[PDB]
Amino acid sequence: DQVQKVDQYLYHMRLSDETLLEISKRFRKEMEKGLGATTHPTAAVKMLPTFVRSTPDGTEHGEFLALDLGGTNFRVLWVKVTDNGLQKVEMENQIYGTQLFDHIAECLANFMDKLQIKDKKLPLGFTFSFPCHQTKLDESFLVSGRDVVALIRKAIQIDIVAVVNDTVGTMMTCGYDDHNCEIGLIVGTGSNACYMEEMRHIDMVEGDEGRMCINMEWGAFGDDGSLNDIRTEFDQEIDMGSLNPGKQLFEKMISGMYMGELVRLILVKMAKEELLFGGKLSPELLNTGRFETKDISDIEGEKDGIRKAREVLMRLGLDPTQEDCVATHRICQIVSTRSASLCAATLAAVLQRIKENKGEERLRSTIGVDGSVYKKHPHFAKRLHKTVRRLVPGCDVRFLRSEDGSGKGAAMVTAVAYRLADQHRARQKTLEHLQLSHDQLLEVKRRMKVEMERGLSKETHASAPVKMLPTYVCATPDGTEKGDFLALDLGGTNFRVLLVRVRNGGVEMHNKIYAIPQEVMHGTGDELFDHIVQCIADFLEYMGMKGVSLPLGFTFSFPCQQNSLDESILLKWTKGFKASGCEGEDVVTLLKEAIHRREEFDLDVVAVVNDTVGTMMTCGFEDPHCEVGLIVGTGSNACYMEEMRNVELVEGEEGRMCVNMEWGAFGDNGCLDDFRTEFDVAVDELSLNPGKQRFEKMISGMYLGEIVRNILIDFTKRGLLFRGRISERLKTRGIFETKFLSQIESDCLALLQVRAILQHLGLESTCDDSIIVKEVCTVVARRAAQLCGAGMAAVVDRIRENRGLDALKVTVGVDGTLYKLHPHFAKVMHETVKDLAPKCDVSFLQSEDGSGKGAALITAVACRIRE
Numbered sequence: 078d079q080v081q082k083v084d085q086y087l088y089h090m091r092l093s094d095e096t097l098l099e100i101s102k103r104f105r106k107e108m109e110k111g112l113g114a115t116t117h118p119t120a121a122v123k124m125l126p127t128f129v130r131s132t133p134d135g136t137e138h139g140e141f142l143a144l145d146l147g148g149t150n151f152r153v154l155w156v157k158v159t160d161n162g163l164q165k166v167e168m169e170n171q172i173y174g175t176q177l178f179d180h181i182a183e184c185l186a187n188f189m190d191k192l193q194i195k196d197k198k199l200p201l202g203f204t205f206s207f208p209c210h211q212t213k214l215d216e217s218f219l220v221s222g223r224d225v226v227a228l229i230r231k232a233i234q235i236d237i238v239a240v241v242n243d244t245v246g247t248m249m250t251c252g253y254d255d256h257n258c259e260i261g262l263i264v265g266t267g268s269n270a271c272y273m274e275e276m277r278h279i280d281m282v283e284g285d286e287g288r289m290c291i292n293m294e295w296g297a298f299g300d301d302g303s304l305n306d307i308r309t310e311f312d313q314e315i316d317m318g319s320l321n322p323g324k325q326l327f328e329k330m331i332s333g334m335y336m337g338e339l340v341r342l343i344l345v346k347m348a349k350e351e352l353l354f355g356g357k358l359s360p361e362l363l364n365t366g367r368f369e370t371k372d373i374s375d376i377e378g379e380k381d382g383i384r385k386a387r388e389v390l391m392r393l394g395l396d397p398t399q400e401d402c403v404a405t406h407r408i409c410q411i412v413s414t415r416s417a418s419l420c421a422a423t424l425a426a427v428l429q430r431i432k433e434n435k436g437e438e439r440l441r442s443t444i445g446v447d448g449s450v451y452k453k454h455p456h457f458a459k460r461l462h463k464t465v466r467r468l469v470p471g472c473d474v475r476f477l478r479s480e481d482g483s484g485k486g487a488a489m490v491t492a493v494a495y496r497l498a499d500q501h502r503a504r505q506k507t508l509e510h511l512q513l514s515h516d517q518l519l520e521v522k523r524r525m526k527v528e529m530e531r532g533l534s535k536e537t538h539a540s541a542p543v544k545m546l547p548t549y550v551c552a553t554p555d556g557t558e559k560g561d562f563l564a565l566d567l568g569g570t571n572f573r574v575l576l577v578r579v580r581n582g583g584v585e586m587h588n589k590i591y592a593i594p595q596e597v598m599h600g601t602g603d604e605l606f607d608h609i610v611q612c613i614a615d616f617l618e619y620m621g622m623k624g625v626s627l628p629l630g631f632t633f634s635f636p637c638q639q640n641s642l643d644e645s646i647l648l649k650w651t652k653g654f655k656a657s658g659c660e661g662e663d664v665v666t667l668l669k670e671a672i673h674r675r676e677e678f679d680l681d682v683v684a685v686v687n688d689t690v691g692t693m694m695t696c697g698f699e700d701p702h703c704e705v706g707l708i709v710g711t712g713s714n715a716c717y718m719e720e721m722r723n724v725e726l727v728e729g730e731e732g733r734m735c736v737n738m739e740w741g742a743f744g745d746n747g748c749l750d751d752f753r754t755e756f757d758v759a760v761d762e763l764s765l766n767p768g769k770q771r772f773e774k775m776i777s778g779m780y781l782g783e784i785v786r787n788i789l790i791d792f793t794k795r796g797l798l799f800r801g802r803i804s805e806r807l808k809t810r811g812i813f814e815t816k817f818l819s820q821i822e823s824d825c826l827a828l829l830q831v832r833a834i835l836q837h838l839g840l841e842s843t844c845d846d847s848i849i850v851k852e853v854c855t856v857v858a859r860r861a862a863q864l865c866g867a868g869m870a871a872v873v874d875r876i877r878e879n880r881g882l883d884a885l886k887v888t889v890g891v892d893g894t895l896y897k898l899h900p901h902f903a904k905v906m907h908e909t910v911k912d913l914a915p916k917c918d919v920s921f922l923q924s925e926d927g928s929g930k931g932a933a934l935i936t937a938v939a940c941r942i943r944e
């Protein structure tokens with residue numbers, strides 16, 4: 078009965094759920110304004126970057142050091158951690174110009190009274206009460222004054238240090254106890270909170286890509302007038318009386334420092350109005366601060382706390398009724414309940430942000446909490462929890478409590494900062510072996526040159542790993558070439574048959590792709606060319622060509638010995654094919670025999686060319702400056718036009734010949750060994766042909782994905798990735814496809830596509846893992862594009878010297894899936910060529926018609942020469 082009058086009188090201090098949703102929405106707008114780059118400097122809620130980028134792992138370990146500067150205690154803590162199950166961190170502390178740092182800073186040996194640690198150079202966690210502006214984990218300056226984190230160091234005569242808000246320290250120690258804790262919260266002398274934000278949302282820090290803890294400083298929510306319609310006569314007066322009038326308006330209606338004073342002032346207003354005490358106001362009731370937050374807890378805590386109201390009201394010298402002790406009780410509830418409901422509105426907004434960032438239909442999140450009002454007040458926690466869960470029904474939230482706070486939380490942030498830095502240099506020492514200097518890439522260029530000579534030399538051509546094989550392709554297309562030409566493209570991902578229909582005064586192009594069943598690729602050679610010619614027939618019919626008599630160019634991309642344009646002998650099947658009775662055989666004969674067994678059409682097989690050569694001719698039809706061809710794909714190879722005088726395996730010195738380099742075998746004689754890593758060695762030794770195609774295995778095919786998953790497995794074993802947990806998929810050779818490198822490195826911001834892939838190889842991965850995985854794919858694919866570039870530099874610069882030129886303008890026909898679908902690799906190769914062959918001006922061109930079109934052109938050119 079007396080309550081209902083207080084309830085009615087304090088009516089504006091009892092806030093409905095509807096107005097708490099209004100408030101939380103308002104605080105989200107305040108949230109975005111402080112994160113935004115234009116709005117920040119005018120934002121009331123500053124949304125400060127913490128530079129804490131990871132919550133605790135569970136694996137942290139070490140001896141750590143730290144100090145609480147809050148000024149109440151001025152304590153200095155100590156802690157040690159270990160990665161075993163029991164999570165207790167051993168904690169021991171005792172409380173406490175240029176002379177100004179060194180005053181009690183003498184305790185470096187004085188807090189060694191326990192472990193006498195002054196011989197141990199040791200990391201330092203640092204928590205700092207006053208306000209600052211920090212640009213890094215270690216850096217800051219006070220506004221209420223130059224440097225700090227660096228200035229406390231020159232007072233040295235050992236440390237590694239970071240500086241953190243007490244709300245972040247709270248989140249971090251609750252994080253080591255529960256790994257789901259993304260929010261710190263303090264309700265105490267003051268009130269603030271921090272949470273983990275996505276780096277794409279933090280404009281004030283460059284990044285994209287990652288999470289950072291944001292120190293909201295919500296104490297200042299409302300300093301611009303956004304809370305005025307819920308603020309109160311009593312709030313205005315607490316503000317005007319404050320040491321900081323105008324600032325911290327939300328903190329003042331929440332924090333413990335102002336709650337006693339807020340109910341006092343309410344008593345005074347009611348006494349003066351005859352509603353309490355019979356208007357008899359003692360002297361002490363008018364003295365500021367005598368009704369204290371401590372008292373609000375006592376009145377509300379106990380069985381009969383209506384007596385302890387009476388006990389306190391008389392400590393202030395009054396004559397309370399019982400109906401007076403009842404009113405002071407409910408005035409206490411209304412103040413502390415409004416405080417609790419207000420932290421629930423602004424948490425409701427933070428939890429709604431994290432839910433959005435995350436993508437989960439129900440947020441599962443853990444709030445680390447601390448501070449006088451939360452822990453000691455009997456009912457504040459129950460009302461905060463109950464009120465949050467009502468404002469976010471799609472929550473599942475759980476709160477935790479940290480004994481340490483600003484003390485051990487500053488140590489725990491040093492444990493995570495140390496862990497990260499330690500695992501980083503570990504990963505970086507590895508990745509550095511795949512990072513090649515300018516000088517190194519010139520040496521690669523130089524070594525490719527002598528290997529090119531070695532193979533062109535008839536003396537050394539037998540031992541030489543880069544064979545420099547003659548292609549018997551000497552003649553560009555010339556003016557009039559007429560007629561229909563069949564071509565074949567075999568050995569790529571796509572086997573296809575082509576009819577290029579060439580007019581003069583105009584190349585008409587037609588193709589079709591056919592599958593080769595694994596059973597046929599792995600069958601007998603009869604079955605394989607029977608199948609190929611059954612596709613030629615299905616195509617002739619598809620074209621209404623039926624049995625017409627057509628010449629045939631043939632792109633066959635396997636290591637052959639060519640004795641002439643129409644004769645080449647297969648050395649070894651590669652890629653998918655193992656078909657019997659083929660290796661060691663003329664490939665044109667095997668094809669011709671399969672055409673006769675079909676007994677349908679007459680085909681004249683004029684030429685067999687490597688895909689490099691076919692690609693160079695395709696691109697040269699458009700661009701007459703194209704003297705080179707390059708594949709980066711299932712495999713890597715290249716060809717240029719050499720001088721007949723330099724091709725000793727073919728008699729005569731007049732003119733040009735294209736030479737298939739087989740450059741993938743560069744390094745089969747050892748010449749790359751001192752640029753090769755353990756992961757190269759391992760990929761080589763577990764491959765199908767150990768010791769063969771070493772350069773190919775650094776720059777292309779499946780081999781790139783294998784280098785990645787060899788690195789990722791090396792990292793995981795060392796606990797440097799995925800928190801040490803190995804997937805079974807990840808253990809499988811070939812599982813990490815080279816197209817993942819393109820997808821992972823094309824990915825940005827949330828890195829969702831990287832995670833999708835890591836899921837596929839079923840791995841339990843954080844968003845920081847995705848960043849590390851993307852780092853690895855970028856190193857590997859850059860070493861690939863730089864190596865390919867160092868080879869292609871030697872190629873083009875040799876063409877330049879052969880011709881005496883001071884400057885060479887060349888075009889390089891390129892093809893292969895890795896070159897055209899990877900985001901950076903064409904870019905980085907071109908840069909490497911321009912960097913390593915300054916005297917050459919190299920265009921690259923991307924065929925789009927495939928190497929078949931050049932097979933058909935090489936055929937047409939070979940006809941006119943005989944016609």
Ligand SMILES: O=C(/C=C/c1ccc(Cl)c(Cl)c1)N[C@@H]1[C@@H](O)[C@H](O)[C@@H](CO)O[C@@H]1O
Pocket residue numbers: 208242243244263265266267268269270294296321324328
């Ligand atoms: O002390 C402050 C704010 C100081 C400040 C900053 C800028 C200006 Cl312009 C002014 Cl007038 C004051 N905030 C504290 C939080 O850092 C802390 O997390 C929380 C719990 O300890 O207490 C307070 O809310």
Ligand SMILES: O=C(/C=C/c1ccc(Cl)c(Cl)c1)N[C@@H]1[C@@H](O)[C@H](O)[C@@H](CO)O[C@@H]1O
Pocket residue numbers: 634635636648649651652687688689708710711712713714715739741766769770773
């Ligand atoms: O596959 C190979 C060669 C492999 C090879 C050679 C010799 C031996 Cl002894 C052994 Cl074990 C394997 N060469 C291909 C080139 O012909 C093709 O131009 C390029 C692009 O398709 O892919 C490959 O590099």
Ligand SMILES: O=P(O)(O)OC[C@H]1O[C@@H](O)[C@H](O)[C@@H](O)[C@@H]1O
Pocket residue numbers: 566568569570571632634688691692708709710711712892893894895926927928929
């Ligand atoms: O090796 P990949 O990724 O299939 O790319 C190489 C092939 O690419 C094709 O587009 C060309 O037409 C072929 O001549 C070539 O062999």
